[PDB]
């Protein structure tokens, strides 16, 4: 009941700001929102420190409403509500002079409430309430300024592509009903220990759960929906790409650690898709001529990293990366957001550059961020990244092809981060800006984000240096293991990650400074700017053809109706043939008469 | 007791037709709403308030009534939807009377505790519907009318042979449902009778090839769509199946099940998919309704109490949110004068809270969890998947097409650049709105409480298909 409060406050608040909210002064919906979120984090951390929480309630028969707050749930909850709160305050700042302040912070509280509903669930349909709900609130925020056509269709595409995934989720969820009949994650896990049964069907359920996860965490093929989420206000992009949403992609796997830990094929494939998503996201990252998009591809890439982690059976590692990334990505996005509140939303790259001296304190932020994403040797993103790189080699499912690949991906993730920072802050000048730049309530929490960025860091350090996180994560859920580990060579590996990342950052610094950008690479910049031409291909045999089939089936239906009219006319016609049977000549009626009578007497025998 | 709740909208409608004025029938629908709700709360069980009276003693037809766990909310649901139709309304023809009549008729329909009386109501509901169609508007009024009416009638008249056959071939003394169930029909007797129930029931569901009447009906009624809203409460086919068709002659359904599940699936997919291409609210809501019904029927046909409960539930609630969307559409008509989707884009800035209301309704429609649609859609998914998984799957490329049509419509109607600007909200429309939202939210958040009456019926009539 206290557990439900965490969910209730930024709903009650959402409801105030959506319903009233325009009845509030310009700071206030932000103040309420950030206030209810403030003690959600707080008042749920009280629960976590007190050892745990449980909730069970009335719902669809056989499917009660069950919230379990344990370590695995608490970790997520602290990330979401904390970073989310920071983003609430930041949103108090960046949202100003904009009508529908009410709308914004209503949507914000709402979002928080929904995520809390998702991560605290002991039953998959409650989890599903979480899923569709968070998808909805994303839709709502992304279109916040509605007067623009471009930022409308974005959210539509979001919730559609995403609902493909939700459909997978539903299907998998139906699969484990017919099978077990519980649909409560705790008892569903306790029912999955032992011999199991009908393994093909279980693998299918997990695979559809994943088909959902792909949508929610923006992996391939449903990758395409995330880049266009730039449309919404920047702190919305901050909330989606870092502290909420995609992370649930990973979390669904992490609570389902029990389910996937017994599925070698599926997990192999998860790691494959993770690697491909990382690589794709990274190659197409730097060509981007827009500041937002170029960061979004790093979101995609890094989430690919996490799915690689959770792929090979390193779940706590995937969550480590989730954590570090939750810090440095939020840092990046809030940085870039601060940047275009300065240029009045100029939001371009080629139209930018040479902001180093002129911008105080922002340079520090964006630098810390791009370096953590680059995986600077002492910084969070580093520790997470080779936690993963090592987990590749060490964990089951083999990591040999994967390691090298992920390492090259580390090179590129370094490179594009550096292109970003270079093209944004260096290389002469273009455009206009005058006095204030950063207000107090933006950079103040953004600083804290830089802090967390650097020091997310050492919470898990390779083993002689204490691994604080792994024991926290493993027992409560994330149960099952089977891993070797090794040393002397391993620090060789860490050294390799450090060295390679360091080399990659500087190579990025010079190249993307360059100006020659020679020959083939410019084509590469085109392709990367155009995202390797995926959407054009999705409207090839997928979208436009489905859209057309709607019409085809429509006209078919129209024709159906017309054919029914055909029968009506057939009966009419037959009728007047029968009405033509009567000419009006009496001899005619007499002959038809005797005819009929003989027909009857014939019938009688 | 039951018969009062059954009769209340009927009388009020008369008092609206000849009687004056328009306003009273609104609180009439409200009263029906309150009483039906009252019977909904305090229910003892299957019997509730039982009623038996002689009708044709010699024929064996008696007035037979009561509220099941099923009949139940359906009084509340119908009372509600029609009430909104009364209040927010604006058809105001003095045929809001024709509406209250139609509401009451449907109430009588669900309460029927014997076959022939059920039959009687089933056929009777047609008339106001055709009237509020015919004389209350539309240019193509007469042809659409012949379409809707003749589809229903050609479906209907043969069923009387089955309702006779159900009594006569089973040697049931009366038309009482209890009695009829007490004497089961045998192989290739139950076959023909089930089939005869199945045509009349399929055409009113609707399923895929037989739905061609639904778009013309909803287009030509009075544009507020009171007539339309009540027309959707008239979509009762699934209820008739589960209550009557399957339990009286299940042996045939055992054979027909594959086909029925298929048709339900294809209705759902085709419905949601075709809905996309729709350029107007009447047509769109029509095809959407077709999809939902697809889902419900899918749920029922699977056996599997899960799916069935989902189906009936989805039915009940979709009456409400669909009827709501109809009334709402009409209300934006009266202020604008057009039901076209593409023209007149800006609304959202112009209309202060309508975006929220219409959105809520549409979210309920696509079957989002927390709103009325998802419990039914999901339980349905479960059961459908139990019987035939494939058909559950085909049926469930629905949600994709559903979100497609619904979001496309919502965006292009509300979100974009300003027009002139629109009237904000009517005082009727406010009651409409809030009450709607309340209904949707309550049926969505507590799918447990509603549908508890559905649960015994669900599993028992599923096992009816068992040994």
UniProtKB/Swiss-Prot annotation, chain A:
Family, per entry: Belongs to the complex I subunit 5 family.
The UniProt catalytic activity note for this protein reads:
a quinone + NADH + 5 H(+)(in) = a quinol + NAD(+) + 4 H(+)(out)
Q: Which Pfam families match?
A: Proton_antipo_M, Proton_antipo_N
Q: What does this protein do?
A: NDH-1 shuttles electrons from NADH, via FMN and iron-sulfur (Fe-S) centers, to quinones in the respiratory chain. The immediate electron acceptor for the enzyme in this species is menaquinone. Couples the redox reaction to proton translocation (for every two electrons transferred, four hydrogen ions are translocated across the cytoplasmic membrane), and thus conserves the redox energy in a proton gradient required for the synthesis of ATP.
Partners and quaternary state?
Answer: NDH-1 is composed of 15 different subunits, Nqo1 to Nqo15. The complex has a L-shaped structure, with the hydrophobic arm (subunits Nqo7, Nqo8 and Nqo10 to Nqo14) embedded in the membrane and the hydrophilic peripheral arm (subunits Nqo1 to Nqo6, Nqo9 and Nqo15) protruding into the bacterial cytoplasm. The hydrophilic domain contains all the redox centers.
Name recorded for this polypeptide: NADH-quinone oxidoreductase subunit 12
The record gives the membrane topology as: Multi-pass membrane protein
Q: From which residue to which does the signal peptide run?
A: none
Enzyme Commission number, as recorded? 7.1.1.-
Q: Does this entry carry the keyword tRNA-binding?
A: no
Q: Where are the transmembrane segments?
A: 1-21, 29-49, 75-95, 104-124, 126-146, 165-185, 206-226, 234-254, 266-286, 303-323, 325-345, 364-384, 397-417, 441-461, 492-512, 584-604
Q: Does the keyword Membrane apply?
A: yes
GO MF annotation terms: NADH dehydrogenase (ubiquinone) activity; quinone binding
Q: Which branch of life, at top level? A: Bacteria
Curated annotation (Swiss-Prot), chain B:
One GO cellular component this record assigns the protein to is: plasma membrane
A single GO BP: electron transport coupled proton transport
What catalytic reaction does the record list?
a quinone + NADH + 5 H(+)(in) = a quinol + NAD(+) + 4 H(+)(out)
Question: Which UniProt keywords are present, listed alphabetically?
Answer: Cell inner membrane, Cell membrane, Membrane, NAD, Quinone, Translocase, Transmembrane, Transmembrane helix
The organism's place on the tree of life at top rank:
Bacteria
Which stretch is the leader sequence? none
Compartments where located: Cell inner membrane
EC assignment: the record states 7.1.1.-
Q: Does the keyword Nucleotide-binding apply?
A: no
Q: Name one GO molecular function term.
A: ubiquinone binding
InterPro entries associated with the record: NADH_Q_OxRdtase_chainM/4 (IPR010227), NADH_UbQ_OxRdtase (IPR003918), ND/Mrp_TM (IPR001750)
Residue ranges annotated as transmembrane are 1-21, 23-43, 47-67, 69-89, 91-111, 115-135, 144-164, 190-210, 258-278, 284-304, 308-328, 354-374, 390-410, 430-450
Broad class of where this protein is predominantly found: membrane
Question: How does this protein sit in the membrane?
Answer: Multi-pass membrane protein
Instruction: Write out the similarity annotation.
Output: Belongs to the complex I subunit 4 family.
Its job: NDH-1 shuttles electrons from NADH, via FMN and iron-sulfur (Fe-S) centers, to quinones in the respiratory chain. The immediate electron acceptor for the enzyme in this species is menaquinone. Couples the redox reaction to proton translocation (for every two electrons transferred, four hydrogen ions are translocated across the cytoplasmic membrane), and thus conserves the redox energy in a proton gradient required for the synthesis of ATP.
Q: Tell me the subunit arrangement.
A: NDH-1 is composed of 15 different subunits, Nqo1 to Nqo15. The complex has a L-shaped structure, with the hydrophobic arm (subunits Nqo7, Nqo8 and Nqo10 to Nqo14) embedded in the membrane and the hydrophilic peripheral arm (subunits Nqo1 to Nqo6, Nqo9 and Nqo15) protruding into the bacterial cytoplasm. The hydrophilic domain contains all the redox centers.
| Protein name, UniProt field | NADH-quinone oxidoreductase subunit 13
Source organism (scientific name): Thermus thermophilus (strain ATCC 27634 / DSM 579 / HB8)
